[PDB]
Write a protein that binds this ligand. Structure first.
Ligand SMILES: Nc1ncnc2c1nc(Br)n2CCCO
Ligand SMILES: Nc1ncnc2c1nc(Br)n2CCCO
Ligand SMILES: Nc1ncnc2c1nc(Br)n2CCCO
Ligand SMILES: Nc1ncnc2c1nc(Br)n2CCCO
Lengths: 261, 261, 261, 261
C-alpha cells in the first residue's frame, strides 16, 4: 500500500521514522505523501492533528495511526517499542478500522467558508465584548455574553472541552458538545450554564449582536474573521478512520491519562 | 381505547380530571386502571413519575401524556386549557409516539433485585463513609470516595444530574450519564471529576470496599439495602412512549424552564 | 507542664505514644488527661478532631499539636521521626503559639443548643426535600432548595468545603465560608450559586419552610434534630491554639497534600 | 468643596449631570476636574471604573459616589431620582466614608511598571500556550497551564471572578482571590483547581517558562507586554473611599443584582 510518515521533528521521532521506513522497505509498501492509504504519525496528539489536516480531503481512503514518543496521547496511543510489530501487520493488511465523528463549522460573511475539526472549534471576540445570540434549530435559545463558546467532538471532549467543565463521552456516540467560557449571569443576562449535547442533524447557529469580528479556531489553526453574519455548527457526515491491531478501550485511555498509568 | 387518569390530589387537578372523564364519556373510550392503553397524568413531573412506576410492567402497550396544573414540567408539558382538545385527538387516534431511553439498575447481595428509572438512580452510604470501586466494562477505572454517585437518563439530565454539574443531552440519544457528588481529590484519592456519558451496552459496576450498606434510590423511591455485593448500571432495552399532538422540542422545553417563558 | 496523648488505636500509634511518654518521663512533665496544658494527637486529622472536641471547654489553656502516622494531615503535620525532638522543646517551653478561627453553630427549637466546629457544619433534610430561607444579618437573601449547605472554617476549607467547589483561604483570615450542595436553579428557584465569605460579626440564619427536622453535623458528630425553629452561623470568639517549633506555611501544606510531596 | 462629574455620554446621563451642576451652583461648591474632593460618576460600573483611574493618584483626598442611569451597579448604586437629595448632603458634609481594598500589580522586564486595580487583573498568552510557574511567598506552588489567571479584589469578586467560579467575599475583608481559567489537569500537569484567598502582605509571583509575552489587563485597560521576567500580585496599601448617605449592605446589592430586585 501507499504510506507516509510524519515526525515531530526531534531526534527520537526522526530516528524511529527512518527505522519504520527501512522496515517497510522489506515489504510491498510504497512511500507516497500525495495519495497515501496509511498515514503514520510519530510524536504526540498535536503531531497527529497536523497529519489529519494535511489529508482531510482524503479521509475516506486513509486509515490513520499514531505513535507517541512522549507520554500517552489519545490519538497517538502506540509505544515506540511496538513500531516493528506495527510494520508487520500493516503490510499483511486484514486489520480492522474504527471511525470517530467529526464537527463541521460553516462561517458566513457579507460567501461561505467551511472547516472540519477533530477536537473542537471555539469562538472569541477580538478586543471588545463577546455577545452572540444562540439559535438551536432555527429557534432562539439564549443570548450568551462572556469569553466565548466551545463546540467539541466526541473524541475531543478529553481536551479543551474537559477543562471547561464539559463531560467525557464515548467516541462511538455521533454527537457534539457545547460548553461555555466564563458566562455572565445576572438578572439581565441568562445563560443555561450546563453543557449541551446535540445529536446528529441538529444545527447550532451563532449570530452577532454588536461587533462582527470574531477570533475563530479549528483545532490548532486560529484566524481572525471580519464581518461575520453567522456561525453554524453541526455533526459532519465525514468520519476519521483508524487502524486497530489490539483492544485499547477509550475508557482505559482515559484512566491511563488522568487516573494513573 | 382503555384509559386512566391520575391526579395530584388537589382541587385544580381533581376538577380537571373529572372534566376529561366526562369529555371522554362522549366517545368510544373506556376507563380502566388495570390494562390501560392511554395513561394521563395531571399535576406535575412528580405526579408523572408515579404514573410511570404504576405501570412499568406494561410500558410497551401504553402511551403516556402529562398535564401540568402548575409550572411547565418536562414530562407534563400540556397546559390545562388544552385538555378539551386533548380528549378529541386521543379518541380519533392516528397520533404519533415518541420514545425515550431508560436506565436499568441491578443490585446483587449474598439474589438479584432490578429496577427501572426514568430520571436517575443514586447511591449513598448509610452513616459511614462512601467508598466504592468503579468498574467500567470489567475494567477497574477509579476508586471513588465522596458523598455518592448519580447515573442519569437522557431526559433525566435536566433534573438532579443538572444540579451536580452534568450536561444536558437530547433524549433521542441512547446513553446514560454518570456524575459525582462531592468527590475527594488529594494525592491519595484520584477521581476523574468530569461527567461520563456511556453508550448502549456499556456496563458500569459499583463494588464496595469496606461498608456493604448503601442508600440506593430510583427516581422517587429510596430504600436501604444491606450486604450489597455489586451495583450494575446500563441502558435499558425498554423505552417509555409518549403521545404527541404538536411539536414541542426538547430544547424549547429547556428554554422555557431555565431561560424564560 | 500537664500533658496528655491520644492515639489512633493501632500499633504504630500506640507504640509511638508510649515512647513519647517515656521520653516525657525524663523531664518535669506530668501526665494528666483532666486539665492538660499540652494535648498531643497521634494518628491523623480525624484523631486530631477528636482531641479538639474532648477539650473544647479548655481551649484557652491548651496548645494542640498533631503527629501523622499515615499521610500528611493539615492538623497532624509532624513526622513520627520528629517525636523525640518534639519532647525536648515541649519541656523547655519558650515555643510560639498560632491561633485559628472557629465556627459557632446555634440551634433553636420550640431552648438553645450551641456547638463549636473546627472544620465545618452542614445541614441536610431527613427524608423529605430540603428547603430553607437564608437570612443574612436579618435580611432575607435567598430560598435555598437542594441537598444542603456547608459553613466552613478557614482551616476547614481544605476539606468538605473544597469538595463542594469552595475556595481555600488562609487560616489567618477571621471569616467563614458558605457553599451549596446541589442547588436547584430553574425559573422559580433562584440561588446565588457562588460561595460566600462572611467576615466577623456577620450572622447567617437558616429558617425552615415546610419540614422542621434536619440532619445537622458538626465536624464528625452528626445528630438528628426535631422541631428546629432556626439555625444560626457566625464566627466564634474562641480560637484553637497550636504549638509551633518550625515554619510550615499553610500554602506549603496545601502543596504537599494536593500537588505533590 | 471642589467636585466634578463624569457622564456615560448619552442624553439620560448628560441631562442629569447638568441638573446636578445647577443644583450644586446653589451651594458653596466649586467645579474642578483637576483637584476635586468629590467625584460623582453617572452611568454604570464601567463609567465608575473610568472615574477611578482618572484620579488614582489622589485616592486619599477623594470620596467617590456613583449613580446608575441603567440597572443597579455595585459601585453606581444610586437611583437618578435621588440626585437632588444627594446634592444637599454633599454640600452640608458630615457624611461617613467607606473604604474598600485594592490590588497592586507589579510587572518586571529585562525596569518596573506598577498598576492599581479596583476589580481584577488577568494574565493571558499572546498566541502561543500560557505556561507559568506560580510562586507564593518565595515558595514554588504549582506550574499552571491553561488560558490564564485572574487575581480579584474583594469588591471585584462579583464580576469576572464570579464567572470563573470564584467566591464572593465581603469588601470589608482585606484580601485578594486568585482563580483559574480552563486549567489542564492530566497525569503530568497538576493545578490546585480551587480558588485561593490570600491575606494582606502575601505575594503571589507569576514567572514565565517558555514564552515571555503576556496580554495583561487591569480592570478595563489591556496592553501587551514583551519580555516579562515576573508578575507580582499583592494587596495594595491604598484604598478607595466612598460617600455613604444611607445603609446599602453589600449582601443586599448582591441580592438585588443576582436574585431579584
Ligand atoms: N483529543 C485530545 N484529548 C486529550 N488531549 C489532547 C487531545 N488533543 C490534543 Br492536541 N491533546 C493534548 C492537549 C494538550 O495536553
Ligand atoms: N426530568 C426532570 N427534569 C427536570 N425537572 C424534573 C424532572 N423530573 C422531575 Br420530578 N423534575 C422536577 C424536580 C423538582 O423541580
Ligand atoms: N481540615 C482538613 N483539611 C483537609 N483534610 C481534612 C481536614 N480535616 C480532616 Br478529618 N481531613 C481529612 C478528610 C478525609 O481525607
Ligand atoms: N465590581 C463589579 N461587580 C459586578 N459587576 C461589575 C463590576 N464592575 C463592573 Br464594570 N461590572 C459590570 C460587568 C459587566 O456586567
Amino acid at each position: 500500500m501507499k504510506y507516509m510518515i510524519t515526525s515531530k521533528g526531534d531526534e527520537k521521532s526522526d530516528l524511529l521514522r527512518l527505522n519504520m521506513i527501512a522496515g517497510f522497505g522489506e515489504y510491498d509498501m510504497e512511500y507516497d505523501d500525495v495519495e497515501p492509504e496509511i498515514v503514520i504519525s510519530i510524536g504526540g496528539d498535536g503531531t497527529f492533528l497536523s497529519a489529519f489536516h494535511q489529508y482531510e480531503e482524503r479521509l475516506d481512503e486513509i486509515a490513520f495511526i499514531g505513535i507517541h514518543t512522549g507520554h500517552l496521547g489519545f490519538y497517538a496511543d502506540w509505544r515506540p517499542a511496538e513500531a516493528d510489530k506495527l510494520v508487520k501487520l500493516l503490510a499483511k493488511g486484514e486489520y480492522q478500522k474504527v471511525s470517530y465523528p467529526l464537527l463541521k463549522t460553516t462561517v458566513k460573511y457579507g460567501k461561505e467558508a467551511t472547516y472540519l475539526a477533530l477536537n473542537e472549534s471555539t469562538v472569541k471576540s477580538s478586543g471588545g465584548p463577546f455577545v452572540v445570540d444562540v439559535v438551536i434549530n432555527d429557534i432562539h435559545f439564549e443570548r450568551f455574553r462572556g469569553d466565548g463558546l466551545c463546540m467539541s467532538t466526541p473524541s475531543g471532549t478529553t481536551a479543551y472541552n474537559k477543562s471547561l467543565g464539559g463531560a467525557l463521552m464515548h467516541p462511538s456516540i455521533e454527537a457534539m458538545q457545547l460548553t461555555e467560557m466564563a458566562s455572565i449571569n445576572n438578572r439581565v443576562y441568562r445563560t443555561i450554564g450546563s453543557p449541551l449535547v446535540f445529536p446528529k442533524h441538529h444545527v447550532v447557529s451563532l449570530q452577532p449582536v454588536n461587533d462582527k469580528d470574531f477570533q475563530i479556531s479549528v483545532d490548532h489553526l486560529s484566524i481572525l474573521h471580519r464581518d461575520v453574519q453567522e456561525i453554524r455548527y453541526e455533526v459532519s457526515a465525514k468520519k476519521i478512520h483508524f487502524a486497530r491491531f489490539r483492544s485499547f478501550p477509550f475508557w482505559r485511555r482515559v484512566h491511563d491519562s488522568f487516573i494513573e498509568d
